[PDB]
Amino acid sequence: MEAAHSKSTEECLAYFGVSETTGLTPDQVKRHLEKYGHNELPAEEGKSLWELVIEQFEDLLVRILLLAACISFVLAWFEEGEETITAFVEPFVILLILIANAIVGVWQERNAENAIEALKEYEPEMGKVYRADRKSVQRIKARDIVPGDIVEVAVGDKVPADIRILSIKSTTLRVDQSILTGESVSVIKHTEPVPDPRAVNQDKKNMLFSGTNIAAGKALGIVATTGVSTEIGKIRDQMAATEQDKTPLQQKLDEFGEQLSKVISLICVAVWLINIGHFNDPVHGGSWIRGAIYYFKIAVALAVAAIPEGLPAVITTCLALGTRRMAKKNAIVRSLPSVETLGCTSVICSDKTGTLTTNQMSVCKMFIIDKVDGDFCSLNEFSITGSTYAPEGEVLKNDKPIRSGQFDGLVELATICALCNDSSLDFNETKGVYEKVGEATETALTTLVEKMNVFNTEVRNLSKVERANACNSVIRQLMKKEFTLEFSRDRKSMSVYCSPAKSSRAAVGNKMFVKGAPEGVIDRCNYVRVGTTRVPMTGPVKEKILSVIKEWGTGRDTLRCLALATRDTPPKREEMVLDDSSRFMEYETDLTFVGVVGMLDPPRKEVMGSIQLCRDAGIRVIMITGDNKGTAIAICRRIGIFGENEEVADRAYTGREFDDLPLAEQREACRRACCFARVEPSHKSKIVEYLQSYDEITAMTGDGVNDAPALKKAEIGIAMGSGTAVAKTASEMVLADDNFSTIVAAVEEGRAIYNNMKQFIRYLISSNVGEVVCIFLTAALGLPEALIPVQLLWVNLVTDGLPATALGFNPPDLDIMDRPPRSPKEPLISGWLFFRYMAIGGYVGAATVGAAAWWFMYAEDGPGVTYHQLTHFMQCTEDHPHFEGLDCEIFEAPEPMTMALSVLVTIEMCNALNSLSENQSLMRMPPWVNIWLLGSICLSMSLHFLILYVDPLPMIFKLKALDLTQWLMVLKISLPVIGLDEILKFIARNYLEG
Ligand SMILES: C/C=C(/C)C(=O)O[C@H]1C(C)=C2[C@H]([C@@H]1OC(=O)CCCCCCC)[C@@](C)(OC(C)=O)C[C@H](OC(=O)CCC)[C@@]1(O)[C@H]2OC(=O)[C@@]1(C)O
């Protein structure tokens, strides 16, 4: 049953043909259950199985590196050698890294909390119904309840489905719908029907929602919807139906993986293509397959040379280290990758109360009527000092303190504020400060009653523990509050019937002290109280009152005003039937205006600043409030979101307004909007959606299942520290202190971690730009094989893997926040940088192979080896350069290799330094600035010797401790990389592409 809330309990019972007394017949149940199904959210999947694994090994790069193993295992099996400790290395070092980055990948012991899971935690397990098969209140399984059957709920119960209350048995029923919105103040329910076919959950006063728990009372009603067909289930589906796109970085690392996987095999073609000589000469000898292994031993080398198997380790390190660094600033980042996107954040959507503000209501100003006459009436305005909840402050008129009670009206003023209040003030002993008890507003009202003290009641000689509510009580003693008509968004007001306590002498029968939003209440006043007398409400007057209410709510002192009025001659206790909600309005007419009070929820002392920061950062911030458009706009000028005098006719919309705008006009409004007031439920999702139709990285603030969809949807959802678990499990970041400022901080932080990430990323892969180049020369022109496949691994996980991580601590460049937000579609490497990293990548390919080519020929090893022909013959079947001797064993010995690798590890250390900036030389960017970089460079070479001296290592690496004479060449062969660098890096001046 869809709009059960708009039907009468009758129309509603009839819709299903059920007796409020008998129940659903066993048939109807099975029958109904076949039609609607089980009152349960659909189940999910995702646990320990073969899936996680196989998908783990589905990635390209992890495959190309697995294929190298599916070949190295056999390649390092046919290889001739008495060694059995260096053979099963390659097929293991890889097969190890593959399985290593598969555990820390299938690691779901931490990151495994889904938002839809908690959603099932809000739906109870059992519920009580009334079928026709048993006259007893059978407590069946919740899962078996069905639209149509009449259920029972009583205190403490968790509502099993969406029911349409039929009959309330208790005095009054109160449920805790916080689960949905968050304002943990339980609400009264009624049986009267909400006729508006499209009321919003908050206004469906005659309905219980599944997930909600009953605060007070006990009622019986007829279930309207179960399963996904419910407010909770509906929210579930929206989330189920939303799929977040992959983050920008993760999107590049894939683009790379693809363009790479192609270029890798693209070079395997050049090999079998450059072989134009091997097609003829090669005769008998069985080398058909014995010589073809050369085409395989180059793949499991060319491949591992272009795959930075150390990146998915560094980026995670730098990231995990940022998570903590941000946690220190109160920003808890759940999703890791997010630290990247949080930097491309272009729009911040924040709620006002308790994020942009403190949620510290306090009454500042208030007034009553002074004199009414000749259509020209005046007023008496006061101000109140004290922004705390502590009854510590004074009431002053004309900047000077006055005795609130010397003023007849200010009395009744204070009277209403106390008897028309469902709250109290409490001094917390332990802590040592008065705290609110309930609605933060009404408390501010209570605190006013104290500060005021219209009856002069002694309070100096009292205890902070019993003085907090002294004056209020005094007033509760002169009037007996019988019953009270709760607030409603229709009448925007809320009265409270009172009776004259026997212990009095001023009893004008009964009274009704009304208090609500100025407009409504004031419009229902036929009179105005001028002191003690009463006089007809006249236009001029109403004109004057509304006048001052308009100034306080839109002025420079953003105030929330409440009209205070009363009914002098209230309807007879008999003529009133409390159960009739919508009827309350009438019971509150023929009123008498008494006064107004304007309170303030101060914007947080640090927000005014951050809003500015977001300006310099080019980040657009959108405040979402509950204030009325008019005051929203003020608070906005106030906190900086708008100029002190900017045009905002079209930049701020109310929810109603935004609804009267057709799709085109709505979207077109989200790209300029900065303030939304009284926005409707869906709207958060709507807005997010629109902001995105502009490729905008949007941050959304919220809490409660209510806002789960939007948090999921938005690029960066932001739950509050005090928020629901679901709202937290749905967001990407949780604000430890629910403060706006900490969102901006975290944005900047996450904006630095990329600037540094972008470095070690274009560095750790810049070396791979060479390793392949090297391998191409070391395979194209001759086979002076300088870089072993099982040797490059250690050079990518430590040799350069250490300076990378060290690069994850580079000094944050100034003005970080004085530039517009990055572009999720900005490639790390391209343009002048493409050509830059091009040379530096080929040059390191002329350096590595050269340590073995430039060597033989000018070295102190080989008097007649210079200008050799390692290109012509390699198999060595005869002797031309050397007749009878033992020289055809140099093609496989630690001599030309142990020289290249060293140079490699030398040019990289200079390239790491070339990776501290992108324009400023090392002269302006002292390579000793990043203290943690040097601390790694040293631990880099400190391990280079360890695999060159300590025998157990230098052997398995095919290297040997180079003489300090021949090791002096590693300098003038590597060291000059910085020149080419510094050249291209100093040439970015004429090329104003940076
Ligand atoms: C891994 C190692 C190597 C050496 C490789 O071939 O990487 C290429 C490649 C895949 C790209 C290129 C490299 O291009 C070549 O080497 C082309 C052949 C040159 C022959 C010249 C003979 C005189 C990157 C490396 O290099 C330079 C130096 O410009 C930059 C960049 O990479 C990134 O931005 C990735 C970061 C996530 C990518 O253009 C990228 O392709 C993309 O889609 C990107 C966006 O990925």
User: 351 an active-site residue?
Assistant: yes
398 is in an annotated binding site: no
As a whole number of angstroms, the distance between CA 305 and CA 779 comes to 13
Find the helix packing angle between 69-78 and 60-67, rounded to 10°: 10
Ligand 1 centroid – CA 918 distance (Å): 18
842 Cα nearest atom in ligand 1: 23
**Residue 672 vs residues 469, 649, 715: alpha-carbon distances, Å:** 47, 11, 19
260 Cα nearest atom in ligand 1: 10
Choose the residue to mutate in 65, 759, 765 for probing ligand 1, maximizing ligand atoms within 8 Å of C-beta. 765
703 is in an annotated binding site: yes
Could you write out the DSSP letters of every residue in 605-669? TTHHHHHHHHHHTT-EEEEEESS-HHHHHHHHHHHTSS-TT---TTTEEEHHHHHSS-HHHHHHH
665 is in an annotated binding site: no
Choose the residue to mutate in 769, 774, 843, 981 for probing ligand 1, maximizing ligand atoms within 8 Å of C-beta. 769
- On whether the CB atoms of residues 97 and 105 are closer than 8 A, the answer is no
β 525-530/591-599 pair status: parallel
304 is in an annotated binding site: yes
User: If you take atom 33 of ligand 1, which residue's CA is the nearest one?
Assistant: 829
Of 141, 236, 201, 211, whose CA–CA distance to 149 is shortest? 141
Exposed, middle or buried by CB within 10 Å (0-12, 13-18, 19+), for 563? buried
Q: Is 829's C-beta closer than 6 angstroms to any atom of ligand 1?
A: yes
Please report how many Cα atoms fall inside a 13 Å half-sphere around the Cα of residue 725, on the Cβ side. 9
Resolution stated for this PDB structure, in Å: 3.1
Q: Is 828's C-beta closer than 6 angstroms to any atom of ligand 1?
A: yes
Instruction: Tell me the backbone φ, ψ of residue 393, rounded to 5 degrees.
Output: 180, 170
Q: Is 837's C-beta closer than 6 angstroms to any atom of ligand 1?
A: yes
Q: Is 846's C-beta closer than 6 angstroms to any atom of ligand 1?
A: no
User: If you take atom 40 of ligand 1, which residue's CA is the nearest one?
Assistant: 256
837 Cα nearest atom in ligand 1: 28
Q: Is 730's C-beta closer than 6 angstroms to any atom of ligand 1?
A: no
Structure token digits, residue 476: 């509760």
The distance in angstroms from the start CA to the end CA of the chain is 64
As a whole number of angstroms, the distance between CA 264 and CA 266 comes to 5
User: If you take atom 13 of ligand 1, which residue's CA is the nearest one?
Assistant: 769
* Alpha-carbon dihedral angle through residues 179, 182, 184, 186, given to the nearest 10 degrees: -70
CA angle 606, 608, 611 (to 5 degrees): 105
102 is in an annotated binding site: no
Of 835, 981, 852, whose CA–CA distance to 918 is shortest? 981
Structure token digits, residue 91: 């097929």
As a whole number of angstroms, the distance between CA 363 and CA 601 comes to 9
796 is in an annotated binding site: yes
768 Cα nearest atom in ligand 1: 2
As a whole number of angstroms, the distance between CA 848 and CA 842 comes to 10
Instruction: Tell me the backbone φ, ψ of residue 28, rounded to 5 degrees.
Output: -40, -45
Compute the chain's Rg from CA coordinates. 39
Q: Is 794's C-beta closer than 6 angstroms to any atom of ligand 1?
A: no
Which 8-state DSSP code applies to residue 24? B
Ligand 1 centroid – CA 828 distance (Å): 11
Residues 6+ positions from 128 with CB-CB distance below 8 Å: 137, 138, 139, 140, 151, 152, 153
CA dihedral sign, ordered 200, 203, 207, 212? positive
Query: Which domains are assigned to the chain?
Result: 1-46+113-240 (2.70.150.10), 47-112+241-345+739-994 (1.20.1110.10), 346-358+603-738 (3.40.50.1000), 359-602 (3.40.1110.10)
Q: Is 764's C-beta closer than 6 angstroms to any atom of ligand 1?
A: no
Q: How was this structure determined?
A: X-ray
Ligand 1 centroid – CA 831 distance (Å): 12
User: If you take atom 4 of ligand 1, which residue's CA is the nearest one?
Assistant: 769
- On whether the CB atoms of residues 491 and 520 are closer than 8 A, the answer is yes
**β-bridge mates for residue 986, sequence order:** none
Of 531, 212, 229, 525, whose CA–CA distance to 371 is shortest? 531
As a whole number of angstroms, the distance between CA 867 and CA 800 comes to 34
Q: Is 641's C-beta closer than 6 angstroms to any atom of ligand 1?
A: no
* Alpha-carbon dihedral angle through residues 221, 227, 230, 231, given to the nearest 10 degrees: 120
Residues 6+ positions from 779 with CB-CB distance below 8 Å: 271, 298, 302, 785
Choose the residue to mutate in 253, 256, 774 for probing ligand 1, maximizing ligand atoms within 8 Å of C-beta. 256
Of 812, 696, 829, whose CA–CA distance to 754 is shortest? 812
Find the helix packing angle between 741-764 and 311-327, rounded to 10°: 160
- On whether the CB atoms of residues 696 and 677 are closer than 8 A, the answer is no
- On whether the CB atoms of residues 820 and 748 are closer than 8 A, the answer is no
Q: Is 260's C-beta closer than 6 angstroms to any atom of ligand 1?
A: yes
How many C-beta atoms surround the C-beta of residue 386 within 10 A?
Answer: 18
Q: Is 768's C-beta closer than 6 angstroms to any atom of ligand 1?
A: yes
Which is the catalytic residue, given 149, 162, 351, 981? 351
User: If you take atom 23 of ligand 1, which residue's CA is the nearest one?
Assistant: 842
User: If you take atom 5 of ligand 1, which residue's CA is the nearest one?
Assistant: 769
Of 215, 211, 202, 214, whose CA–CA distance to 232 is shortest? 211
User: If you take atom 29 of ligand 1, which residue's CA is the nearest one?
Assistant: 834
Instruction: Tell me the backbone φ, ψ of residue 481, rounded to 5 degrees.
Output: -70, 105
How many C-beta atoms surround the C-beta of residue 753 within 10 A?
Answer: 23
Q: Is 253's C-beta closer than 6 angstroms to any atom of ligand 1?
A: yes
